[PDB]
């Protein structure tokens, strides 16, 4: 069971994690180096022991694909998860006083579509600039599925300081065998309680999208974590969630045949049968 | 973090791996996404079921650290593992007609010490150019141990076309807690029988070096693999190797207090009690 692996990681962190503070000084139980395999075969890994913000997962990814680094473009979709990091106070705390609100810097969207390009601002035109990693992985999957270099890297040391926040998802690698597309994510830091479930859904979704455009079947989503942690305040709540028997994962349905990654829209996706346990 | 995890991985690939060919149409049994943990606490992960080319590991790493991209600089040390990719014929095959022999392009050393810098040639001076990820990692470890961004990435989409080979160890992350330095390597592709043991030792050594430079004790080396594979002509040999009784890992002795990562020399290291099953 995929979810069982996730809950297993949580148990392991409770049993073997050690105290480790984050940037704010808040404590967490932490374990370095973890890995879970989530099958994407005939099911979508949207955790059931606790509700995952699906609209956020979907809109954020379409926003990444779009190459946007403007939090306002995601906020207007009803997803505010990046608004704080693009706010005046936050951008100023980073020294980006002349940066317009919403300008997150060269984050995912930019890295994925224009890696290496000289970031100006969120409104700048980068067409033809940088390496379009996303389309490249798609091309490679179609032409040379055996390729062991189908990677999309968001971790750009040069652009790091310009980003409102360093990416938690440094890079992901795709793999194809027997008509199945698999994806492994290297997540440098994961909040098992709140972020990871969302993280998992995001990349499983990216895989489903690429598999659809490349005519492959979703295979496995391998979630690799660097600092896998649990905030101390989620220990008891998590001990409760761990008591809940996971439910069948929902299924993802793509309502139409999409040809290019850029053509996907929120409306083309439908999460069916998602029945998460009641909020804790 | 035992060698039993490495053996277990081999066992799993032999058991669940599926046929997948490499760039040369050569078949391998492959599993995508694997991870093994190797304790570095009072022991060094130099595999004992089959001898690892320690000199190669040590010299290659020192070579990475000095930021060299000149295979000749490593070859002169008696380590020829990079010579082929820097040869006149190989360089020309990739269209690098203007490159002096040995010029591997912006590979590991360059990325590690000058990420983002404009690669010219192996003789070019890149002082203060690009991001020195290695020193930054060391600086961050010393100043903010809790940092969850202690990463050194060799994967540079931008420089890929200029390299003799795309980096295999795409990136590694370090982690500090309870005065222990851990390192996790994300290896996109790994030949379980040949490269992986070497790869493991390389990053284990790097961790030992940085741990020593930062006054921390080596913790764990987590090896994460993308396409973990075994070449077909290695199945039987590896199955035999799986029969070999794993022995206690040797110890890595650092014979001197080194202040800067750049000051480490081959002679500062000594593998002790390495007793691998003969080949």
Swiss-Prot record, chain B:
One of its GO terms (biological process) is DNA biosynthetic process. There is a cross-link at residues 260, 265 (Glycyl lysine isopeptide (Lys-Gly) (interchain with G-Cter in SUMO2)). GO terms for molecular function: folic acid binding; mRNA regulatory element binding translation repressor activity; sequence-specific mRNA binding; thymidylate synthase activity. (6R)-5,10-methylene-5,6,7,8-tetrahydrofolate binds at residue 191. The active site is at residue 168. Belongs to the thymidylate synthase family. It is linked to Dyskeratosis congenita, digenic: A form of dyskeratosis congenita, a rare multisystem disorder caused by defective telomere maintenance. It is characterized by progressive bone marrow failure, and the clinical triad of reticulated skin hyperpigmentation, nail dystrophy, and mucosal leukoplakia. Common but variable features include premature graying, aplastic anemia, low platelets, osteoporosis, pulmonary fibrosis, and liver fibrosis among others. Early mortality is often associated with bone marrow failure, infections, fatal pulmonary complications, or malignancy. This is Thymidylate synthase. It comes from Homo sapiens. The gene is TYMS.
């Amino acid at each position: 069971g995929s979810e069982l692996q996730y809950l297993g990681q949580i148990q392991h962190i409770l049993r073997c994690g050690v105290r480790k503070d984050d940037r704010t000084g808040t404590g967490t139980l932490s374990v370095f180096g973890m890995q879970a395999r989530y099958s994407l075969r005939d099911e979508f890994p949207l955790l059931t022991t606790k509700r995952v913000f699906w609209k956020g997962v979907l809109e954020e990814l379409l926003w990444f694909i779009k190459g946007s680094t403007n939090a306002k473009e995601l906020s207007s979709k009803g997803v505010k998860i990046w608004d704080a990091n693009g706010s005046r106070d936050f951008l100023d705390s980073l020294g980006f006083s002349t940066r317009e609100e919403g300008d997150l810097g060269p984050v995912y969207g930019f890295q994925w579509r224009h890696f290496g390009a000289e970031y100006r601002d969120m409104e700048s035109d980068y067409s033809g600039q940088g390496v379009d990693q996303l389309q490249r992985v798609i091309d490679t999957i179609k032409t040379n599925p055996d390729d062991r270099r189908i990677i999309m890297c968001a971790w750009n040391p040069r652009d790091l300081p310009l980003m409102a926040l360093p990416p938690c998802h440094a890079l992901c690698q795709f793999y194809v065998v027997n008509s199945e597309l698999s994806c492994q994510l290297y997540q440098r830091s994961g909040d098992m309680g709140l972020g990871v479930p969302f993280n998992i859904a995001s990349y499983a979704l990216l895989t489903y999208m690429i598999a659809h455009i490349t005519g492959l079947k979703p295979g496995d989503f391998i979630h690799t974590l660097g600092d896998a942690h649990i905030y101390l305040n989620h220990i008891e709540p998590l001990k409760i969630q761990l008591q809940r028997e996971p439910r069948p994962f929902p299924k993802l349905r793509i309502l139409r045949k999409v040809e290019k990654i850029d053509d996907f829209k929120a409306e083309d996706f439908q999460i069916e049968g998602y029945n998460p346990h009641p909020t804790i």
